Amino acid sequence: LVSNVIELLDVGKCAVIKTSTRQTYFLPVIGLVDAEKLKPGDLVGVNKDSYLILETLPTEYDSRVKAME
Amino acid sequence: LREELQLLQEQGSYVGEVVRAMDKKKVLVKVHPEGKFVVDVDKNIDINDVTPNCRVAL
Amino acid sequence: VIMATNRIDILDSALLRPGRIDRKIEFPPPNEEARLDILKIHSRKMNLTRGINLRKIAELMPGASGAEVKGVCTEAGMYALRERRVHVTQEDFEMAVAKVMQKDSEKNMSIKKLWK
Amino acid sequence: LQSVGQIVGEVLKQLTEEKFIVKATNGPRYVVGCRRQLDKSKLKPGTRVALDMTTLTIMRYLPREVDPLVYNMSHEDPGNVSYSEIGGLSEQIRELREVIELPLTNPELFQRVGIIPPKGCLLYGPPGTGKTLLARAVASQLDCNFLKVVSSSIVDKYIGESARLIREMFNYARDHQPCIIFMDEIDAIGGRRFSEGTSADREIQRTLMELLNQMDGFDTLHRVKMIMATNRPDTLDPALLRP
Amino acid sequence: TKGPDAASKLPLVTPHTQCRLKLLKLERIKDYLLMEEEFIRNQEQMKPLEEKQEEERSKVDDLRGTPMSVGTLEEIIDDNHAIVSTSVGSEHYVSILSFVDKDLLEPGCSVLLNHKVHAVIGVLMDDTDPLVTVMKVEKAPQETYADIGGLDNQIQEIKESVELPLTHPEYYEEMGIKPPKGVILYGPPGTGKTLLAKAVANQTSATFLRVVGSELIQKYLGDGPKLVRELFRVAEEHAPSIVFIDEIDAIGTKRYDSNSGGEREIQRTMLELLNQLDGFDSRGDVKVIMATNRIETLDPALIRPGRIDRKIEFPLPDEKTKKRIFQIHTSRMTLADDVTLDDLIMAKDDLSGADIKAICTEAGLMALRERRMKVTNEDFKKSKENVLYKTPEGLYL
Amino acid sequence: SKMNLSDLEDYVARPDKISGADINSICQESGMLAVRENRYIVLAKDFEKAYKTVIKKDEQEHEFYK
Amino acid sequence: KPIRALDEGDIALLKTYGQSTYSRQIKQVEDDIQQLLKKINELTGIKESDTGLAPPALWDLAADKQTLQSEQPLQVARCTKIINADSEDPKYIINVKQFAKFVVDLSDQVAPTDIEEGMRVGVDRNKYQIHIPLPPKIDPTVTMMQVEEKPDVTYSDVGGCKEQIEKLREVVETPLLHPERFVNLGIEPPKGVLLFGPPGTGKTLCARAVANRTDACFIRVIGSELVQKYVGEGARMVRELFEMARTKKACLIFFDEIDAIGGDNEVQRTMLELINQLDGFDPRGNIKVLMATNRPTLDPALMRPGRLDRKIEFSLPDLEGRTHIFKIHARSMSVERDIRFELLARLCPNSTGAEIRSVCTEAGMFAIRARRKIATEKDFLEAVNKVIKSTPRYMTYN
Amino acid sequence: DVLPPEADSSIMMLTSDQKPDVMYADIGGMDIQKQEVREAVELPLTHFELYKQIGIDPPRGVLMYGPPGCGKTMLAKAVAHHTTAAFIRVVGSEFVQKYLGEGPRMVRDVFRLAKENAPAIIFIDEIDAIATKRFDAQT
Numbered sequence A: 001l002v003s004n005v006i007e008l009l010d011v012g013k014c015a016v017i018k019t020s021t022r023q024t025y026f027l028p029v030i031g032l033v034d035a036e037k038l039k040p041g042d043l044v045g046v047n048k049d050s051y052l053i054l055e056t057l058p059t060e061y062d063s064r065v066k067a068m069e
Numbered sequence B: 001l002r003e004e005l006q007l008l009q010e011q012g013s014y015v016g017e018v019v020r021a022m023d024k025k026k027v028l029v030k031v032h033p034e035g036k037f038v039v040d041v042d043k044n045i046d047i048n049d050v051t052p053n054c055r056v057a058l
Numbered sequence C: 001v002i003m004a005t006n007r008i009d010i011l012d013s014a015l016l017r018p019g020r021i022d023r024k025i026e027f028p029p030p031n032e033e034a035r036l037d038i039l040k041i042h043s044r045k046m047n048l049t050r051g052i053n054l055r056k057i058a059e060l061m062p063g064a065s066g067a068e069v070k071g072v073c074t075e076a077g078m079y080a081l082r083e084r085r086v087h088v089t090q091e092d093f094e095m096a097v098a099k100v101m102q103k104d105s106e107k108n109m110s111i112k113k114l115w116k
Numbered sequence D: 001l002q003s004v005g006q007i008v009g010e011v012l013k014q015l016t017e018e019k020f021i022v023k024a025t026n027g028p029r030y031v032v033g034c035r036r037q038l039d040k041s042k043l044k045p046g047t048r049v050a051l052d053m054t055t056l057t058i059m060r061y062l063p064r065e066v067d068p069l070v071y072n073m074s075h076e077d078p079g080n081v082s083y084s085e086i087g088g089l090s091e092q093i094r095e096l097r098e099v100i101e102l103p104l105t106n107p108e109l110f111q112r113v114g115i116i117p118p119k120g121c122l123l124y125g126p127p128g129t130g131k132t133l134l135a136r137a138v139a140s141q142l143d144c145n146f147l148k149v150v151s152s153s154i155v156d157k158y159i160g161e162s163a164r165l166i167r168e169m170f171n172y173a174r175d176h177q178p179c180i181i182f183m184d185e186i187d188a189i190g191g192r193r194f195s196e197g198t199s200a201d202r203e204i205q206r207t208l209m210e211l212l213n214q215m216d217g218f219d220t221l222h223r224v225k226m227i228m229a230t231n232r233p234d235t236l237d238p239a240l241l242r243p
Numbered sequence E: 001t002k003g004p005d006a007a008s009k010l011p012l013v014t015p016h017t018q019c020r021l022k023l024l025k026l027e028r029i030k031d032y033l034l035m036e037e038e039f040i041r042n043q044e045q046m047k048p049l050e051e052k053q054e055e056e057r058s059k060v061d062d063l064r065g066t067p068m069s070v071g072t073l074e075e076i077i078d079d080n081h082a083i084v085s086t087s088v089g090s091e092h093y094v095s096i097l098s099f100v101d102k103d104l105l106e107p108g109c110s111v112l113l114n115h116k117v118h119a120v121i122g123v124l125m126d127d128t129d130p131l132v133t134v135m136k137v138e139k140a141p142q143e144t145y146a147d148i149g150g151l152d153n154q155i156q157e158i159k160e161s162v163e164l165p166l167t168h169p170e171y172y173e174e175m176g177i178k179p180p181k182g183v184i185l186y187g188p189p190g191t192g193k194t195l196l197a198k199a200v201a202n203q204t205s206a207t208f209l210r211v212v213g214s215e216l217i218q219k220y221l222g223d224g225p226k227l228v229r230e231l232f233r234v235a236e237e238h239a240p241s242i243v244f245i246d247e248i249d250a251i252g253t254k255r256y257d258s259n260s261g262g263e264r265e266i267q268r269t270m271l272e273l274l275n276q277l278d279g280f281d282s283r284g285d286v287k288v289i290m291a292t293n294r295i296e297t298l299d300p301a302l303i304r305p306g307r308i309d310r311k312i313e314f315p316l317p318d319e320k321t322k323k324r325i326f327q328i329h330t331s332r333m334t335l336a337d338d339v340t341l342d343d344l345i346m347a348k349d350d351l352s353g354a355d356i357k358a359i360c361t362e363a364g365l366m367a368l369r370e371r372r373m374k375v376t377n378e379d380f381k382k383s384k385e386n387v388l389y390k391t392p393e394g395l396y397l
Numbered sequence F: 001s002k003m004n005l006s007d008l009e010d011y012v013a014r015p016d017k018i019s020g021a022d023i024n025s026i027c028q029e030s031g032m033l034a035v036r037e038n039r040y041i042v043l044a045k046d047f048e049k050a051y052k053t054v055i056k057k058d059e060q061e062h063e064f065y066k
Numbered sequence G: 001k002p003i004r005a006l007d008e009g010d011i012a013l014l015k016t017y018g019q020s021t022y023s024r025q026i027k028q029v030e031d032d033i034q035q036l037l038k039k040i041n042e043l044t045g046i047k048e049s050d051t052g053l054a055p056p057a058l059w060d061l062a063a064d065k066q067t068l069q070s071e072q073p074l075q076v077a078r079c080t081k082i083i084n085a086d087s088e089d090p091k092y093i094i095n096v097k098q099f100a101k102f103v104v105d106l107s108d109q110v111a112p113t114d115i116e117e118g119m120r121v122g123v124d125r126n127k128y129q130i131h132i133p134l135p136p137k138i139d140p141t142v143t144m145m146q147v148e149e150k151p152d153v154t155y156s157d158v159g160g161c162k163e164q165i166e167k168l169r170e171v172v173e174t175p176l177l178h179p180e181r182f183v184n185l186g187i188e189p190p191k192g193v194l195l196f197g198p199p200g201t202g203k204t205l206c207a208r209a210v211a212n213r214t215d216a217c218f219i220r221v222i223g224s225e226l227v228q229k230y231v232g233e234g235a236r237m238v239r240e241l242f243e244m245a246r247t248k249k250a251c252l253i254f255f256d257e258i259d260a261i262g263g264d265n266e267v268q269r270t271m272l273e274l275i276n277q278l279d280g281f282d283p284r285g286n287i288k289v290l291m292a293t294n295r296p297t298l299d300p301a302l303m304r305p306g307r308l309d310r311k312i313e314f315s316l317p318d319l320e321g322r323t324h325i326f327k328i329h330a331r332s333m334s335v336e337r338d339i340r341f342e343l344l345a346r347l348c349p350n351s352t353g354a355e356i357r358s359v360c361t362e363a364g365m366f367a368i369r370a371r372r373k374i375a376t377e378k379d380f381l382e383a384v385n386k387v388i389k390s391t392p393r394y395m396t397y398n
Numbered sequence H: 001d002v003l004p005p006e007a008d009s010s011i012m013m014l015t016s017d018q019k020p021d022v023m024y025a026d027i028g029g030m031d032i033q034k035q036e037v038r039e040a041v042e043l044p045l046t047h048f049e050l051y052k053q054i055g056i057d058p059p060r061g062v063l064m065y066g067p068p069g070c071g072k073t074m075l076a077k078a079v080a081h082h083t084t085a086a087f088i089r090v091v092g093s094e095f096v097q098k099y100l101g102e103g104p105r106m107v108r109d110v111f112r113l114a115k116e117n118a119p120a121i122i123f124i125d126e127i128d129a130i131a132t133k134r135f136d137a138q139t
């Protein structure tokens, strides 16, 4: 399930994301990917039941940057 | 106390606005936010008592 | 339906239109007599003293709203409270009028003397 | 794989020692208990928290959510610019070092003297005089949280958003002590208050007074020092100009 | 298609002095209403007719299940599957059962679906959500063209627009001019635009739909355009029909680049209204009437000749129209012989129909103040400045 | 009261339209200057210098206005 | 003077004395009439409420139950970036409408060649596997479309755009019906042309006119249609449209009110699809595109040379043009044969063609007003007095 | 169950720790200003019988105006410190929200919370953010 990683917090790192079911979601462990780039806005594929970041997927667009080819 | 305990374990009923009593057995009712359904009426409730735009329980 | 406003002039013409709003009642600032009545309602629960002339107090309020009259009663009560008393006197009302109705004026005489 | 993730919400109220009224973001609100071992004293209203998705209990508190704009303004690297790389500012750089850093070193010195540590100072001069670089060097020497903020970038058409951004900036500063608020081009915010009545300058006054409250308002400031650089110091508001 | 609506009772309004001609006519009406009541109570008293098919209907009901959700048939596929949107907004690729009327399936008509495993199991031709059902006029307003004073050109124009095509239209195609699709009344407040709409809804032979303009806007995403579409679909279904949208400037303001989501939704709702206005041919028997006070603030695309040809002006009443309105509203009053009413009209002011009605009401109130009901001329004298609240004196002379 | 031991009466006597914020400034600046000079009791010199620094009121005004 | 509020005796005497003797009876009778009306209204009922039940013997209730217990529903979605599958990463992220978006894989029944970015796809509900692509289909019945092959508007039906119609002729007739001159001239025929002007000038029908005389089918596409409810799939729509443009021998593709598009995710998708269709399709073809707008809001990436070769301004009609339009619209109505249409065209300065048509409509309106089957010059005079102009010009100018 | 009437309030009060440490002694001078604030913000909250005996309604709400940095916000800080009332500190610019109708809703929420709580004090610093003289707004 796609989700925008809202940000990363410290506890050895945790995350908070915003899934496309308009729901914010805190993850004590950031799924099964690396944890350095992880931009606050990096769209990710997070599991649909246990809600951990199973994969990272390329960014969608920045609105007007798509408007210009 | 036991009766209240028993009745307190049953799920709540959705409120809805009846669009119109379609038939003597079916009633078109809109319930927020599921949408509109055509429900049936149980034995106790009389259809003629069901008027358009009245809050009913499902 | 009843509506209230401090600025009738800016209301929409389609709202002030009669049939939608009839009897555009105006509430002018109370005159001397009405001010005397307002003082007497708001001084009903006070502990007045013999020899109080509320008429003079009402005369001391040129163009004062009813809310200002109630504020004057409250300030007179406050003045009595300061001296840890329960009765209020005429001078209490006089200085209450002075305090409540106090407003900043045009300090510059030159500006004030533009008009004849 | 054994972690299930958690709701995030904000604590609204402490109903009792155990029952916490907690509102999930963009969702319903509940009354929920806290974990057996937790710092209930830090469960102040508004404290962002996590909720077990099944039992719906206070799981762990979270630091306050930060605005994306504030985050972006907060994570630009100062680049460890050294005090050698300034050039001929000895007396003024010493004064600025005093008024900012000394409260961050020996508050006991000031309290034995008896002064309250200074809240902040203005750095006015013509463009290209190095105010931005000077503040960056101050941050690099401090190696503390730096909020490089330019005033022209916070004015918005959205009516209540500029003052909201100022509130978020100062709330971030209060949360992340020691933080340095560098508000560049402050003449674009505090440009005197006047009653001509155009909407834009009126919103500017609202933002300025929000800044004034966040700066020397009811809530006293501790361990947060501000730097405001401008090229037109003479147009600053007297209320902001006041000590 | 079906037929129009808005049933009304007898005009009556031939006598008003309460001279038992009223009583006789009203007693006749009451007698007929009594025969209504008795006839239907007897028919329900004995009417045994049920069952018959039973088993096939019972098994089709079992197949349908309970409850059945209604959706909008957004699109159709090969004649076993379709695309249906639930009222939430989600649409699904579902199957179509045999017992559905394949001729009835069209994009837009409400479809009864199965609660579980959604599948088109029926068609509802009378969805008519409670809002749009409300906007449809049931009881005709008691006002009529007799109650309207003046505005003879306005009445002529509105009848030539919405009545002549409804009645014998052969003049239109005989001249070959397409009938005027839609008419916008406008003018200063309280000139009689809504009153004229009421009078049209009285002397009518078509489904009259009253709308508020601001009523169309709805909170939920896509609810606005969906409601506008439902309104116009009901208009076509019950054609001929007249769709009166009072206060069109509630949405008709100049279109500007939307920024927030809500303004985008408002733009969407107006775009859908304009699209629906364009959708039906002018040769169709559905007309719209839009009234407003701030005509100058309307989008100059809604009033295009290709969309709304006519533009009825409602100017402030003239002196003769003022006296007409005064006569109309003073009909039920027991005025004395001293009253003249000419002084009030001769006074150069900006009285409107609403203003004159209020003047009459206040004159009656003043008469009631003096414990009388004959209403002198002095009562009107006082009432005029009582209700008319608010050039520097001798500057112009 | 929190200041050091340290003519405050004359400074009060000086006619200057200054607010309580200015007084708090003056005192704070006096303490800051004493910290600069590394003396734990302010006196006439640094206190007066802070007083001048606080209430600048430098006109920089073209004399044709007066 | 303090006015006295009415007392109980005052109210009681007011309701009597000065009353009609029949007050009680009449008011009571009206009340019973209203009560009986509400009685009838509540008791008459609702009736069917007849669901869409097919006539019997068309029912396969056994097979219907089989489908109910066997077949499954699929939520539809707009598929998005392919994630560069290359047969090892076939997942795509799909947005199910106002619901969420999920990265999913294909069903075994569909090949990846059938799935591409931006097409509606029907998927299951738990695995969300794309089960079947759902092309939105093309038909003039839905939305509005070209709905025209040989328009009935000829060169005699257009006036006031002689220079404009000449320019349009050079645009479309010369390369289409005379490709030899462009070929031997060694010049690429005009790939793109834009027709800008105020609304109501006549622009659309002008193209339609040449569309009848270019021996090619006319295409009408409304930008608002691309931007209203028919957004999203519209790209694919025009895809299929452009596709059918390739199928036909010659297509006069024209987009109405491109301002709704030229000035927005799916809108940008439709735009870039148009860019691909134009810059991708060989300019030597025979489906030349006609562009028109009211607001010369067009993106700078569009009129770059190679996409819009020519620009044509459609100004307001002149005296000859306005009188031609008057005569054209009078040809379709019952008027006398001695109407000074030059007079009327003079009386309508800076008037749009649609305004002229409305003027003729109002002339017919006035003729109907007097119930005269033949409209007169007086009727047209009142019509122009009404429509046009929406003492000063006669007491100073003479 | 039923919750306290306004427990789920968006706007928060002054907790015990949030209370400032400024005392009435830390405010030099301003004897008459201190008295004129206490008579309406402190005395009625603790000596209501004093007002009832005189049969007067205590003053409710005070404006504090003057040149900047003369002690207004400090006097408010002290009042918050030296009071048993629930204190709602707000600032005028805080009221002006983005979304339409959210500002008035916040005002209503603040006053409703104060009403539903004990005798409470609403301090709105910089009231001229929102309470400037009304005029013919054209936007």
Ligand SMILES: Nc1ncnc2c1ncn2[C@@H]1O[C@H](COP(=O)(O)OP(=O)(O)OP(=O)(O)O)[C@@H](O)[C@H]1O
Binding pocket: C014, C019, E147, E148, E149, E150, E151, E188, E189, E190, E191, E192, E193, E194, E195, E196, E291, E292, E293, E325, E328, E352, E353, E354, E355, E357
């Ligand atoms: N020509 C008229 N003759 C008699 N009464 C009139 C006339 N014009 C207006 N009125 C009276 O004015 C009242 C209000 O008029 P109406 O509701 O039509 O207003 P309007 O002009 O449409 O204004 P708005 O849309 O601004 O409310 C009517 O109830 C009617 O009694």
Ligand SMILES: Nc1ncnc2c1ncn2[C@@H]1O[C@H](COP(=O)(O)OP(=O)(O)O)[C@@H](O)[C@H]1O
Binding pocket: D085, D086, D087, D088, D089, D126, D127, D128, D129, D130, D131, D132, D133, D134, D229
């Ligand atoms: N002491 C200094 N005074 C002025 N400019 C300087 C100084 N030190 C460095 N700079 C130059 O100033 C540039 C940075 O801009 P800066 O002058 O700091 O911004 P501002 O316009 O705020 O003064 C650097 O590239 C640097 O070369």
Ligand SMILES: Nc1ncnc2c1ncn2[C@@H]1O[C@H](COP(=O)(O)OP(=O)(O)O)[C@@H](O)[C@H]1O
Binding pocket: F019, F020, F021, F022, F024, H026, H027, H028, H029, H030, H067, H068, H069, H070, H071, H072, H073, H074, H075
């Ligand atoms: N009467 C006073 N006693 C002590 N300190 C004062 C006094 N007046 C002002 N100050 C100093 O000036 C500042 C006054 O801030 P304040 O006057 O509350 O701001 P504003 O007037 O803008 O609300 C305080 O921080 C304090 O240090």
Ligand SMILES: Nc1ncnc2c1ncn2[C@@H]1O[C@H](COP(=O)(O)OP(=O)(O)O)[C@@H](O)[C@H]1O
Binding pocket: G157, G158, G159, G160, G161, G198, G199, G200, G201, G202, G203, G204, G205, G206, G325, G328, G329, G352, G353, G354, G355, G357
């Ligand atoms: N040159 C013309 N010849 C004939 N009719 C015209 C001409 N120009 C305008 N019209 C009239 O104007 C009306 C609207 O023109 P239309 O093509 O819809 O305007 P637009 O160019 O804005 O689309 C048509 O009904 C037509 O009768």
Ligand SMILES: [Mg+2]
Binding pocket: E189, E190, E191, E192, E193, E194, E195
């Ligand atoms: Mg009206």
Ligand SMILES: [Mg+2]
Binding pocket: D216, D217, H072, H073, H125
């Ligand atoms: Mg302050």
